[PDB]
Every structure is written in C-alpha cells, then in structure tokens.
Design an enzyme around this catalytic site. Structure first.
Site, PDB file in Angstrom:
ATOM      1  N   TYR A 101     -26.220  32.134  37.785  1.00 35.93           N
ATOM      2  CA  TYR A 101     -27.037  31.628  38.996  1.00 35.93           C
ATOM      3  C   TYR A 101     -28.411  32.194  38.927  1.00 35.93           C
ATOM      4  CZ  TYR A 101     -28.511  29.535  43.230  1.00 35.93           C
ATOM      5  OH  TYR A 101     -28.988  28.579  44.356  1.00 35.93           O
ATOM      6  N   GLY A 114     -29.769  15.208  42.320  1.00 42.74           N
ATOM      7  CA  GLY A 114     -29.135  15.862  43.379  1.00 42.74           C
ATOM      8  C   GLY A 114     -29.308  15.217  44.636  1.00 42.74           C
ATOM      9  N   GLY A 138     -27.843  21.155  41.286  1.00 39.99           N
ATOM     10  CA  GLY A 138     -27.722  22.478  40.903  1.00 39.99           C
ATOM     11  C   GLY A 138     -26.370  22.781  41.543  1.00 39.99           C
ATOM     12  N   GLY A 187     -27.280  17.513  50.562  1.00 40.58           N
ATOM     13  CA  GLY A 187     -27.944  18.793  50.880  1.00 40.58           C
ATOM     14  C   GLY A 187     -29.653  18.664  50.722  1.00 40.58           C
ATOM     15  N   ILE A 188     -30.357  19.190  50.005  1.00 39.16           N
ATOM     16  CA  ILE A 188     -31.853  19.339  50.147  1.00 39.16           C
ATOM     17  C   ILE A 188     -32.268  17.916  49.478  1.00 39.16           C
ATOM     18  CG2 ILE A 188     -33.949  20.346  48.967  1.00 39.16           C
ATOM     19  CD1 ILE A 188     -32.346  23.118  49.181  1.00 39.16           C
ATOM     20  N   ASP A 233     -23.748  12.873  34.744  1.00 37.12           N
ATOM     21  CA  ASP A 233     -23.529  14.185  34.461  1.00 37.12           C
ATOM     22  C   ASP A 233     -24.538  15.230  33.900  1.00 37.12           C
ATOM     23  OD1 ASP A 233     -20.728  16.295  33.197  1.00 37.12           O
ATOM     24  OD2 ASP A 233     -22.395  16.821  34.438  1.00 37.12           O
ATOM     25  N   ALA A 291     -27.540  13.136  46.327  1.00 36.95           N
ATOM     26  CA  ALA A 291     -26.409  12.855  47.173  1.00 36.95           C
ATOM     27  C   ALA A 291     -25.983  13.567  48.138  1.00 36.95           C
ATOM     28  CB  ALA A 291     -25.069  12.400  46.232  1.00 36.95           C
ATOM     29  N   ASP A 321     -27.315  11.545  40.721  1.00 44.47           N
ATOM     30  CA  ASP A 321     -26.243  12.592  41.056  1.00 44.47           C
ATOM     31  C   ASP A 321     -24.970  12.399  40.299  1.00 44.47           C
ATOM     32  OD1 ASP A 321     -26.463  14.372  43.934  1.00 44.47           O
ATOM     33  OD2 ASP A 321     -24.675  14.158  42.802  1.00 44.47           O
TER      34      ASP A 321
HETATM   35  N1  LIG Z   1     -28.171  25.859  49.548  1.00 40.26           N
HETATM   36  C1  LIG Z   1     -28.802  26.965  49.515  1.00 40.26           C
HETATM   37  O1  LIG Z   1     -28.671  28.010  50.078  1.00 40.26           O
HETATM   38  C2  LIG Z   1     -29.680  27.213  48.316  1.00 40.26           C
HETATM   39  C3  LIG Z   1     -29.850  26.214  47.236  1.00 40.26           C
HETATM   40  N2  LIG Z   1     -30.703  26.147  46.231  1.00 40.26           N
HETATM   41  C4  LIG Z   1     -30.896  25.173  45.224  1.00 40.26           C
HETATM   42  O2  LIG Z   1     -31.071  24.086  45.837  1.00 40.26           O
HETATM   43  C5  LIG Z   1     -30.634  22.922  45.043  1.00 40.26           C
HETATM   44  C6  LIG Z   1     -29.864  21.849  45.976  1.00 40.26           C
HETATM   45  O3  LIG Z   1     -28.888  22.477  46.470  1.00 40.26           O
HETATM   46  P1  LIG Z   1     -28.022  22.220  47.961  1.00 40.26           P
HETATM   47  O4  LIG Z   1     -28.823  21.051  48.518  1.00 40.26           O
HETATM   48  O5  LIG Z   1     -27.975  23.107  48.697  1.00 40.26           O
HETATM   49  O6  LIG Z   1     -26.467  22.067  47.155  1.00 40.26           O
HETATM   50  P2  LIG Z   1     -25.615  20.486  47.400  1.00 40.26           P
HETATM   51  O7  LIG Z   1     -24.560  20.886  46.779  1.00 40.26           O
HETATM   52  O8  LIG Z   1     -25.521  19.944  48.836  1.00 40.26           O
HETATM   53  O9  LIG Z   1     -26.614  19.490  46.483  1.00 40.26           O
HETATM   54  C7  LIG Z   1     -26.545  19.564  45.172  1.00 40.26           C
HETATM   55  C8  LIG Z   1     -26.423  18.093  44.440  1.00 40.26           C
HETATM   56  O10 LIG Z   1     -26.631  18.375  43.189  1.00 40.26           O
HETATM   57  C9  LIG Z   1     -25.825  17.524  42.633  1.00 40.26           C
HETATM   58  N3  LIG Z   1     -25.285  17.926  41.254  1.00 40.26           N
HETATM   59  C10 LIG Z   1     -24.685  19.412  40.951  1.00 40.26           C
HETATM   60  N4  LIG Z   1     -24.216  19.332  39.597  1.00 40.26           N
HETATM   61  C11 LIG Z   1     -24.827  18.164  38.850  1.00 40.26           C
HETATM   62  C12 LIG Z   1     -24.617  17.459  37.678  1.00 40.26           C
HETATM   63  N5  LIG Z   1     -23.819  18.017  36.725  1.00 40.26           N
HETATM   64  N6  LIG Z   1     -25.154  16.344  37.593  1.00 40.26           N
HETATM   65  C13 LIG Z   1     -25.571  15.451  38.545  1.00 40.26           C
HETATM   66  N7  LIG Z   1     -25.634  15.992  39.795  1.00 40.26           N
HETATM   67  C14 LIG Z   1     -25.212  17.252  40.087  1.00 40.26           C
HETATM   68  C15 LIG Z   1     -24.475  17.579  43.603  1.00 40.26           C
HETATM   69  O11 LIG Z   1     -23.567  16.537  43.071  1.00 40.26           O
HETATM   70  C16 LIG Z   1     -25.037  17.407  44.850  1.00 40.26           C
HETATM   71  O12 LIG Z   1     -25.113  16.093  45.238  1.00 40.26           O
HETATM   72  C17 LIG Z   1     -29.771  23.583  43.959  1.00 40.26           C
HETATM   73  O13 LIG Z   1     -30.635  23.719  42.890  1.00 40.26           O
HETATM   74  C18 LIG Z   1     -29.480  24.999  44.481  1.00 40.26           C
HETATM   75  O14 LIG Z   1     -29.384  25.868  43.423  1.00 40.26           O
HETATM   76  C19 LIG Z   1     -31.456  27.449  46.048  1.00 40.26           C
HETATM   77  C20 LIG Z   1     -31.412  28.349  47.139  1.00 40.26           C
HETATM   78  C21 LIG Z   1     -30.699  28.309  48.065  1.00 40.26           C
END
Ligand SMILES: NC(=O)C1=CN([C@@H]2O[C@H](COP(=O)(O)OP(=O)(O)OC[C@H]3O[C@@H](n4cnc5c(N)ncnc54)[C@H](O)[C@@H]3O)[C@@H](O)[C@H]2O)C=CC1
Lengths: 226, 254
Positions: free
Chosen positions: B152, B7, B70, B11-12, B40, B9, B31
């Site tokens: 989720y 992940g 995620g 957010g976190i 994927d 690419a 990613d």
């Molecule tokens: N943003 C939030 O308020 C919260 C986020 N989280 C968790 O934090 C983690 C990171 O989320 P964020 O950075 O916020 O979201 P985000 O959407 O900005 O980043 C998630 C990254 O995961 C990658 N990803 C998703 N599905 C994929 C797959 N099938 N194969 C390869 N890469 C994939 C996406 O392409 C994206 O680059 C996730 O597990 C999310 O569940 C947990 C609590 C809150």
C-alpha cells in the site's frame, strides 16, 4: 466572511483583495500604505499597531487572515518572519471566534533552497529570538540568503503549530508560489485563487498543508521530495 | 465539462461523481460494478476495456480524469494492491493522455495517500519496478515483501512519484496533473482497516489534529478544485487533505 490581508496594496495581496471583494467577502487591508490599516510590520510597534487596529475594525472576531506582506538582511527577517508570526499570534483569538475560520501564509518556492534549513538564522527565527535572528542575518550579509531562510522558517512555523491551531478550531495552510513546465510564470490572480480556496469551506479538511502553485517547477526539480 | 472517474461506485469517487454531476458536468464512472463502465483495473485486460470504453463515451475528448480506484490493507494480496493502486492508475493515464490533450483546460488528479510518506517506502524494491513499468516484477517483489501495508505505502509512493516525474510530458500535452493525498477518510475502505485483526490497532492508533476523519465529500472538493480553472497554475503538486496529520508527523518536510 471578514478577511484580513497583509500586503493588500500590491501584487498577490491586491489580487486577493479584488478577488474576495468581487466574491462578496469583506476585506480588511493591511499594508505599508494605501490600505485600510497602514502599518510597518518590520517593527514590534508596527505589528502591535496593526493587530490592535484589526481587532478594533472587526470587533475582536475574524473569519480569515492572509499574510502576504513581504520584502538589508535584518529587514527581510523582520518582515518575512516576525511580521507574519506577530500577526498570526496577535489575531489567533479573534480567528478562533470566527465562522469556519482559516488563515493562509504566502510562502515561496525559495523555502526549498538547498541549505536553507541549516542557516543559523533559521534556528533563531524558529526560537522566536528576533534580535539574534536579525544579528545572524546581518552578519551573513546576503539579502537573498535571508529571504530563503525566512521563507523556510515561516513554512516550518505554519506546520509546527498545526496542533495549536487545530485546538483553536482554525485551519492554517501555506501557499508556495513559483521556466516552469507550464511555460510561463503565474498571474497574481492564480495565486490568489489558491489562497481563496484554502480559506474557504471547500478546504474544510486541509490543514498544515503546503500548496505549491508553481506550474510544475517543484515537481520537475524535486520529484522525490513530498 | 466531461470527466472520467475511476472508483466512482463508492467512497471518495462516489462523492466526487455526485459533486461534479450537481455542478453540471458529465461524469463517466468506471468501477468493478455499479458504474457506467464496469472493468477490473487490476489487469492489463481490464484496463484496456476501461480505456476503450471511456474513449467511446467521450468521443475521444476528455476534460478531466480522476484515478480514485484503489484497495487498502485488506486487499486479497500485495500483488493486487500494486496492480490496482499503481498500474490501474498509470495505464489509464497512458491510455487517455491523448483524449485529455484534446479537451478544454484539461486536468487530471491521482488519489494518492499519506501512506506514501511512510518511512522507508521510497526504498522498497517494488517501487523501482513500478516506476520502471515492469508490472510482473513489481507484483513478484510485492508478494516477496510479504505485507499488504508495504504494498500500500509502496504503491502510493510510486504513483505519487510517477505524477511528479512526468510533469513535463503532461505540460507538453497542455494537461495539468496533480495528486491529492488523503489521510483517514470515513469510507468502507477505512472501516475495513479499522476492523482488521492485523491492522486495526495501527489504523486506530492516532487521530489527525482536526480530531476526526474526513468525509469523502471533503476530499472530493479538493479534487474538484484541482480539476478546475481556478487551479490553472497548479501542476505536479501533491495536496495533502489530511486534517493536519502530515504536518504533525513530518513538520519540516516540503
Ligand atoms: N479511505 C481512506 O482513509 C483513504 C483512501 N485513500 C485512497 O482513496 C481512494 C478511494 O478510496 P475510498 O473511496 O476510501 O475506498 P472505497 O473502497 O470506498 O472506494 C474505492 C473504489 O475503487 C474501486 N476499485 C477497487 N479496485 C478496483 C478495480 N480492480 N477495478 C475497478 N475499480 C476498483 C472499488 O470498487 C470502490 O468502488 C483509494 O485510492 C484509496 O487508496 C487514501 C488515503 C486514505
């Protein structure tokens, strides 16, 4: 940062004192002896003295507070619960005036002892009724029960005041130190490093958390509880 | 050290990749696209590709792994949520365990969620199937359960349990494994939830005690701490990074 530490003269408090000093911070040490501020936190008078002495030393402005001081059953409740709560409450204003202020309570994995939550002692502590909590602990008559009950209560206290502390702009977290899966016990410095992390700007969104530092023991024994 | 981040690419994960790189570490990003390794993680095939590619890039020796990929409540369907949030994590842990065991002071972090603590999450049938490793069954149950928010919470609950359940196996490999559980964090994932017809009100209903959402870098700092040598006795722990939300909503649970 100027950081006050109770229990600064031994164990985890002493390791934290050393760590923070080496890292460039200023430490105000509070303990029964061998400390900047020597006080007995088992009495309201000792707590009052310690709070006034800290405020004097820091000019009413404080960046961090760590409550590590801990130890008959009455004494256990007096130090482990009320010696923490009086210091937190007495210094909350000074902390609110500080720079990215934060505080940490050193709990214990004993807070997770089955049945601790249901100890009559615990309700009295959380009600703030020291006389009644001491009486209850003394009639229970098992120091180890008072230890578990006080650690449970003080962990609850941290979490229950999450809104009050947020309102003051001060983070408050707990560290719960712990054969563990890692195959050893912790060095005091390892617990101190978790405390220093939670105190510092790297933990700017961490508030009301209980961080176990126990080499996997809680995960092993309570996998489903989080 | 050399640290793989799923992940990376957005957010976190993106924040963490930047943080670690600036601190001098070698980061291997995985990613869907815009990463060192494009895979994927929602299918066994994609996971296989990712694992093989990571092993090649690190020479079969890894010091850190962060499973951050995620999807949230706006994912395509409940099945996809389980496939990525649970199995995209577990298969990478499974596949890279040996490489981690060969690293120096190695450690891994799963990015969970405060959603794991949703009431009733523990008793969702899909959770049992996840923990049994039966992906087809978990996906079927997730689909039958009918709502992405349940998938989720279920997936986040299950993957958190997984980390804790396997505490001894990871210790035996000399590798620490912890979970970070964010509350709201101001990425594209949160923005998508905030704007969703079905879940927007739910998402916007209550703010954490700190009065704001996290910046992704604040979560990244917690992850970097757990990866590092200053966390040497922290293992199987769940570190909430939520501005007080869990303490507010479950004050007596720990
Ligand atoms: N943003 C939030 O308020 C919260 C986020 N989280 C968790 O934090 C983690 C990171 O989320 P964020 O950075 O916020 O979201 P985000 O959407 O900005 O980043 C998630 C990254 O995961 C990658 N990803 C998703 N599905 C994929 C797959 N099938 N194969 C390869 N890469 C994939 C996406 O392409 C994206 O680059 C996730 O597990 C999310 O569940 C947990 C609590 C809150």
């Amino acid at each position: 940062s100027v950081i006050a530490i109770t229990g600064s003269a031994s164990g985890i408090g002493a390791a934290l004192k050393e760590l923070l000093a080496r890292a460039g911070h200023t430490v105000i040490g509070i303990d029964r002896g061998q400390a900047d501020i020597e006080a007995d936190l088992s009495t309201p008078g000792g707590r009052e003295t310690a709070v006034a002495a800290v405020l004097d030393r820091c000019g009413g402005v404080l960046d961090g507070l760590v409550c590590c001081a801990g130890v008959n059953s009455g004494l256990v409740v007096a130090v482990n619960y009320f010696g923490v709560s009086a210091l937190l409450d007495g210094l909350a204003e000074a902390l609110s005036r500080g720079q990215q202020p934060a505080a940490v309570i050193v709990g214990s994995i004993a807070a997770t002892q089955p049945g601790a939550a249901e100890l009559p002692m615990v309700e009295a502590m959380l009600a703030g009724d020291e006389a009644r909590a001491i009486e209850l602990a003394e009639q229970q008559g098992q120091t180890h029960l008072a230890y578990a009950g006080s650690k449970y209560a003080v962990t609850c206290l941290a979490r229950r005041n999450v809104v009050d502390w947020a309102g003051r702009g001060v983070r408050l977290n707990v560290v719960a130190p712990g054969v563990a899966p890692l195959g050893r016990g912790s060095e005091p410095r390892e617990v101190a490093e978790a405390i220093a992390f939670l105190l510092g700007p790297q933990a700017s969104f961490i508030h009301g958390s209980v961080l176990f530092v126990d080499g996997g023991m809680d995960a092993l024994m309570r996998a489903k509880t989080f």
